[PDB]
Design a binder for this molecule. Structure first.
Ligand SMILES: OC[C@H]1O[C@@H]([Se][C@@H]2O[C@H](CO)[C@H](O)[C@H](O)[C@H]2O)[C@H](O)[C@@H](O)[C@H]1O
Ligand SMILES: [Cl-]
Length: 139
């Protein structure tokens, strides 16, 4: 069944438009956080961070970390995750943005702040999940 969390998925030669990343898992009961970290070495090109309790609200925080400094957050109040339930996250790399769908519904787009797509060569998956599968394909 499981993969180990935190999990590091290599993206050989980085990301490219038409690359589809699929993450299957189950949110733990009483989850606090999920994080996907697309990394360019020490930098986080794209941090996708559902928070289950931020001041008693559920919010998705997206950001970029450059030279160990976080940038301007992009916050999404649409929250498709539920504690205890199975999910599917799909991240489709497009020319201008990452497109995220959860459970086959469009959730958000994140404009590319890191422009060297071919150097975004690691996805880190962490937080309060049982991880089932993490894979990529070209569509
Ligand atoms: O932006 C994304 C980052 O956010 C920080 Se928390 C962050 O702290 C800021 C003050 O340093 C502001 O309060 C932001 O609102 C808060 O989300 C998290 O510790 C980090 O893991 C990451 O998710
Ligand atoms: Cl760059």
């Amino acid at each position: 069944g499981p993969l180990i969390v935190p999990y590091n998925l290599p993206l050989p030669g980085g990301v490219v438009p038409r690359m589809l990343i699929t993450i299957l898992g189950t949110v733990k009961p009483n989850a606090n956080r999920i994080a996907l970290d697309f990394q360019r070495g020490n930098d986080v090109a794209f941090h996708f961070n559902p928070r289950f309790n931020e001041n008693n609200r559920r919010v998705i925080v997206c950001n970029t970390k450059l030279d160990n400094n976080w940038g301007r957050e992009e916050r999404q109040s649409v929250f498709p995750f539920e504690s205890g339930k199975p999910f599917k996250i799909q991240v489709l790399v497009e020319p201008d943005h990452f497109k995220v769908a959860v459970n086959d519904a469009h959730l958000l787009q994140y404009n590319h702040r890191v422009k060297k797509l071919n150097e975004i060569s690691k996805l880190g998956i962490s937080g309060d999940i049982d991880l089932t599968s993490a894979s990529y394909t070209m569509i």
